[PDB]
């Protein structure tokens, strides 16, 4: 069996659904039915291009109208300023042109009156996309940072949004930022190579901040996926990402956008523009979580093996554990330090959502079992039989 231990004593923080969001997962058009497909997820942060159209990175996804469509949901919009420019890597022009366009965006953002902006992302993957531009990335960052501070001082500034976490890049950047009083409010990079290095990378960043005497910043992982782009929005592949983001108290994380012909599917949570996929149902369970997140001890934090995230709600009186990822065909979920409100006997409902493919409609979830468990030594040991690497699972515990 692959084993997870849920420690109800180890309170992390209030539920934030920190990893429920996507890059170009909501646009001006898609999903068409916000109340049906977006609101129930209780999403956190979406990343959207500052501008959209023929002069810009993509023809859809403009941040300001997207924020407007999300205003009745829990969702907030991070503005990707780099998407002002077309082509890959970005067709950066010059600092005069850039700062004028950023000024226009800041004016349009403030003028919209919408209050659900997460902040400004100065640049996207500068480790890969900002070379031979006649200005250094550091110099562009400082000048853009000063403009945003002048015109929108209460907004968050997010970066540097690297392709990959790298200690040496991040050290050079934070050293420059500390020297020039331009530290990001939210430190950000992408995890598009799988989940196996998240915990190490976050540890590395926190150790680096302490090393430079930088007060600990909020973290955003504003693109995440397995290396296999077909596994974007897959419940099993997604669970270790969410688990690690929750374990490390990440401020926000957004699913990748690998399928550029299919914007507006919430990170491949939708199978089509009219139907839910497997991931939607798994993220719906995540959005249902209330109360406090509690620590889950993974099989192996430095792996893509099955991992989970858990909430304890003393008001509604339940425990919910969500999990998935690579396993040996059985998953054991040991729940310890169980609150007295559960009593000596619990109803344990185990449910799953199966995945065939990102574009396969899924119309609901399946019960694996609902059974009585006796609490022994504050512990329930749940064994989930016949598990696979792509399904998502929930263990829901309440008093008998």
From TrEMBL:
| Gene3D superfamilies linked to this entry | Glycosidases
GO MF entries: hydrolase activity
Q: Which InterPro entries match?
A: GH (IPR017853)
Q: Which UniProt keywords apply?
A: Hydrolase, Plasmid, Signal
What this protein is called in its record is Possible beta-xylosidase diverged, family 5/39 of glycosyl hydrolases and alpha-amylase C (Greek key) C-terminal domain
Q: What is the lineage of its organism?
A: Bacteria, Bacillati, Bacillota, Clostridia, Eubacteriales
